Amino acid sequence: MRERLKRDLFQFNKTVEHGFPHQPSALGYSPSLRILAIGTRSGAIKLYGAPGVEFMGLHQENNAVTQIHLLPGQCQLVTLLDDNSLHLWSLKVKGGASELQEDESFTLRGPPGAAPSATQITVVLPHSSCELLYLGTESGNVFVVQLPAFRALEDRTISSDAVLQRLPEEARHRRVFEMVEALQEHPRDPNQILIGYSRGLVVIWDLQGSRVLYHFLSSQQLENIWWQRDGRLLVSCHSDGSYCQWPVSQQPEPLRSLVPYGPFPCKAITRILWLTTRQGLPFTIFQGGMPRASYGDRHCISVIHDGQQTAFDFTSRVIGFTVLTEADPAATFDDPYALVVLAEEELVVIDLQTAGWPPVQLPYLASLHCSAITCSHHVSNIPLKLWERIIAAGSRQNAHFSTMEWPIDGGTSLTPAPPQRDLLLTGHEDGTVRFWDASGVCLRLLYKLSTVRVFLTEWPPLRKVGSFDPYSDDPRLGIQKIFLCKYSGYLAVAGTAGQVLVLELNDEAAEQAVEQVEADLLQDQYRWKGHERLAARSGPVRFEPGFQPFVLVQCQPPAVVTSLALHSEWRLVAFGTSHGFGLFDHQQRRQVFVKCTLHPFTGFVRTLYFADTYLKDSSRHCPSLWAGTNGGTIYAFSLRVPPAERRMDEPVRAEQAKEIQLMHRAPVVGILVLDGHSVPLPEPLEVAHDLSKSPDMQGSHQLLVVSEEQFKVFTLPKVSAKLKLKLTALEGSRVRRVSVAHFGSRRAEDYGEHHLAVLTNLGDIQVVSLPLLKPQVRYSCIRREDVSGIASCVFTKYGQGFYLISPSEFERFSLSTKWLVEPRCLVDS
Ligand SMILES: [Cl-]
């Protein structure tokens, strides 16, 4: 088409990311704005509020973000990188919506000759005045920097020699590096600040008077400090796994000191929080402190409250945590209600209001790799009834969760509700299928299906929370193929050990049995050196509401299922392996036929496609199944399927009508049929739910065969060549994945034409026109070396797509001028 027409239909943009960002390195939180901040090893800063409020930033240096400090009340924040640099970021309104932006940077440095291991920033303390940053260092000196000028103020330096000068000789036995471990402001006096050193000295420093008002020397090495709301109590945690409480009212003694976990040697408690409640029952929240010998490998946050203690246990390293308090600076009690934990592999939120401390569901930042992703499947425009039914069944399996509203709800989303409901399905290594609301900016989990059910498989007070599983339980459970019929609520899933399951959406529970049926693909042939078949449960099994399996087709050999097709109207299931393929009646639960493909691995069945088209006569069109193989062979099978009445009486019959060989012999990656207007045939039950999409039978039908090297069009029923595009011969690329995509014009509202969306082996995304097979546009998208990102890429029926930039995060892009799912929001004072 003309280039003017291309600009109405095609335009490439990467628009938003979905999931949990890879390798987080810092956590921040604004209590005034209720905004969550995540830093990564790559230098990214990601801000999150209410669903639809999102901000992605990137530091010019690719260094890890180690600290994030949102300024109190302000729409600004200060970050710190592992190269010891500070950065002032801002949220500025432009175009009626907020934008994240970096204002300036500053590297604290002493005189030349002074070692860097002395100016290394440990604690960053933004003063409540938002005009100054106090910076504790490894030397033991506290430096001051102006804001928003980012300039050092050497006249306000609080050195270690200046502090130790005001103190008695008993508290002057300093280390070479005093190591500022704590640096905090008085909760009820902006003139007083606390300074804590590694050896154990803590002081309260009069900023204006330049003198020590209070101090003590703890017996154990100091890790951290917490200052009670009223400023009249201090809590210190230490390297031997203990924590002490100190009154603030000269040099006092500890009120109480204890190693909370037995008499065994314990690892350090690295962080502690002491939060009051109006009920007179304080929370004690501390990180670590585990007995070294038998729990040194545990990642724990312990919560103490009202005689109840729980050591929350996470399957990955704690990057940072925060506790949401009801309070603002003026209140008397803290009144916590949520513990937010950023683990290296997931985000966990705990409800602190409800007894038992139940978890809170995530609206975003979901760890898609809780079990490793093994396949993906996107269904666009979901019928609203099935949508609500799947959502409802998801609520039924989430009873253990908290009823609390999502607390990180800051900001306002300027994006209207998604017009159509899009669904993304992910198959996982442990046999689970997760249903995701792929409609807009936030990828929210709606329902989880588990298929392992069809097979036969108190001090310290540890409580395992989170969902990330670092282990590989059983790989043969992994799901390779997914097919959801959005019209019938039927679902087919296929696994790594030849298991094929057909399921149906059920609003209520059931205790039915699952029919085991075998499909021997080597019937006309040999042994099997590999995985033994998954043993199925013989008796009836109870299933909670959702998609419930009623038949299991076990392939013999139990090899990887490499292709899957499901016709809901004809109630048939096609599936292929490296050996052959077969067709299965999921109404009669009986095998229709089986075909071995090891004599035209070139018999690897990679593509399956049902089509009601012209297979033998230009007047008679019958049901048909098409199979494409790695050797360039296309098998076509005529299908005699009875009507609704004789559906169980007489069986479905099938005969091999065609065997088409491609001379260039590239693997068949795509098969489809076009109607008399050169429009692709509609999905099963699509015509039954919309007669306006009835395929043209008056004109001749055409068969489209896409291989890794070429696009070929044949006419039906004769199968003689009419059109061709030799992709690999032209530009040296190979088709890795091809999907039909409807592209809409954005200068003419009621319009659209189908074309082929192509993912090449080089990570490019091309649009090949229908029906003439002319290359339209070529875009750079996935990197050539990113084999995993290419393997995971998946298209939508309307010009969008997803691919993995990491095990736990998708990137969303758009080929179409009709789609641009990007966040737009506003965060005000
Ligand atoms: Cl473009």
Describe the structure.
The protein is mainly beta. It has a domain at 3-373: 7 Propeller (Methylamine Dehydrogenase, Chain H), CATH 2.130.10.10. 5% of the residues lie in helices and 46% in strands. The radius of gyration is 32 Å and the shape is elongated. The structure holds chloride ion (CL). The PDB classes it as lipid binding protein. The entry lists the keywords Lgl, Polarity, beta propeller, lipid binding protein. It forms a monomeric assembly. Crystal structure of the human cell polarity protein Lethal Giant Larvae 2 (Lgl2). Unphosphorylated, crystal form 2.
Outline of the structure:
This protein has 829 residues and is mainly beta.
Q: What's the layout of helices and strands?
A:
Layout: H1 3-9, E1 10-19, E2 24-30, E3 35-40, E4 44-48, E5 54-58, E6 65-70, E7 76-81, E8 85-94, E9 97-107, H2 116-119, E10 121-126, E11 132-137, E12 142-146, H3 160-165, E13 180-186, E14 189-197, E15 201-206, E16 211-217, E17 222-227, E18 233-238, E19 243-247, E20 256-258, E21 269-275, E22 283-288, H4 292-295, E23 299-305, E24 308-314, E25 318-325, E26 336-343, E27 347-351, E28 373-379, H5 384-396, E29 412-413, E30 423-428, E31 432-437, E32 444-450, E33 462-464, E34 479-484, E35 490-495, E36 499-506, E37 515-520, E38 546-556, E39 563-567, E40 572-576, E41 580-585, E42 590-596, E43 605-613, E44 622-629, E45 633-640, E46 653-661, E47 668-674, E48 702-707, E49 710-715, E50 720-726, H6 727-731, E51 735-743, E52 753-760, E53 764-769, E54 775-780, H7 787-792, E55 794-795, E56 800-806, E57 809-816, E58 825-826
The structure holds chloride ion (CL).
Keywords: Cell cycle, Cell division, Cytoplasm, Exocytosis, Phosphoprotein, Repeat, WD repeat
InterPro entries: Lethal2_giant (IPR000664), LLGL2 (IPR013577), WD40/YVTN_repeat-like_dom_sf (IPR015943), WD40_repeat_dom_sf (IPR036322), WD40_rpt (IPR001680)
Subunit structure: Interacts with GPSM2/LGN, PRKCI/aPKC and PARD6B/Par-6. The complex is enhanced during mitosis. Interacts with DCAF1.
